[PDB]
Design a protein around this ligand. Structure first.
Ligand SMILES: Nc1ccn([C@@H]2O[C@H](COP(=O)(O)OP(=O)(O)O)[C@@H](O)[C@H]2O)c(=O)n1
Ligand SMILES: Nc1ccn([C@@H]2O[C@H](COP(=O)(O)OP(=O)(O)O)[C@@H](O)[C@H]2O)c(=O)n1
Ligand SMILES: [Mg+2]
Ligand SMILES: [Mg+2]
Lengths: 194, 194
């Protein structure tokens, strides 16, 4: 694994990704300041330096963070194979579900004795994201199960935390998931439970 | 570039991820048979070998594909930092939207002259996934824009391809997105437009 001078790397004009969410890029950059770039970018020799195969976000985020080098693997590949590698890198991934994410933050706090502030800084996420994820874990087992398997979104879950009675919360959760009610619909029903 | 014997690596029992979707794992394995493991797994020295920091799916999928070794980067880190790295690796990523994915497949076919079969094999995706993604691109610009920004899911879009009249298709797409109609609701609506 090389450390390539950041100035020697330029973008792939044939890149599959067009839009770069600004906030997500900033979060990536914060994680880089905390941990460095964990996974080397893939590049190929091109012109006066290297062109990205896979790693445009790591590259841009490293630039924003003011790094002088980025870890890199130099691949000797054709143009068609470079494009296949870019797609494979992006598409062959499975995200943690919201409960797995929440439990991750909880382990850093409970087992490793980090504050929520430190979690936020060390992983590169907003304080609200960390706080909200942690509040999900107060929900009953069946409801967390619905958040985990994606039958309830994070939005749905945030609303349901306002139901005072645990029996009633669980019944409402089932209804929202079963009828596939929108997040706004769910908010209204919680206020009635009061 | 370090290649560790696959049997010398064992799982972190404090890993943040418990459940592995079987089909996603098979897809990962097929991509590995086609391209190898592109991003080295992160490990630390542990007992008589190495424990995964990040890369349990790559490891399992490499096993399933019958590889004898996996590329790895050996980190000397604390247990708390290892756990932070695992979360960062998983959480600090942005997926291609369904249109970007579809356009990727289309470039391999149109520019690089692969068949759909070869795309499927070389990227590790099911034939149905590739075929369905490609069919999305026949939709009008405004509707693709809604699939790209997530106002319409892939399911919604698949239904809308059956609308014969282009004016009617576009109006219906806007209505589905605006009223946040379910996929089943949308199917019914398409049938009486024939
Ligand atoms: N043939 C392949 C396919 C995916 N990958 C990478 O493997 C990682 C998979 O991420 P993941 O969160 O689903 O699974 P893990 O292997 O990190 O446990 C991504 O960084 C993909 O870019 C690879 O290195 N080689
Ligand atoms: N501090 C960090 C944060 C994320 N990553 C990795 O950077 C990749 C981000 O994937 P991405 O598809 O969002 O963007 P690219 O950098 O691949 O263009 C993931 O493989 C993350 O695990 C890293 O190597 N170091
Ligand atoms: Mg990428
Ligand atoms: Mg991972």
């Amino acid at each position: 694994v090389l450390k390539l001078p950041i100035e020697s790397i330029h973008r792939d004009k044939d890149q599959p990704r067009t839009y770069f969410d600004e906030e997500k890029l900033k979060e990536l950059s914060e994680s880089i300041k905390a941990q460095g770039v964990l996974q080397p970018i893939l590049v190929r020799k091109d012109g006066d330096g290297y062109r990205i195969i896979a790693g445009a976000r790591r590259w841009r985020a490293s630039q924003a963070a003011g790094l002088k080098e980025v870890p890199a693997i130099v691949r000797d590949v054709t143009e068609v194979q470079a494009f296949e590698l870019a797609l494979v890198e992006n598409l062959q991934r499975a995200d943690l579900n919201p409960i797995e994410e929440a439990e991750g933050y909880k382990r850093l706090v409970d087992e490793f004795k980090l504050t929520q502030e430190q979690v936020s800084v060390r992983v590169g996420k907003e304080r609200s994201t960390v706080a909200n994820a942690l509040r999900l874990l107060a929900l009953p087992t069946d409801v967390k199960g619905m958040v985990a398997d994606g039958s309830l979104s994070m939005g749905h879950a945030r609303a349901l935390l306002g139901v005072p009675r645990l029996p009633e919360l669980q019944n409402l959760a089932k209804q929202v998931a079963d009828k596939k009610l929108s997040v706004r619909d769910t908010e209204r029903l919680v206020q009635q439970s009061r």
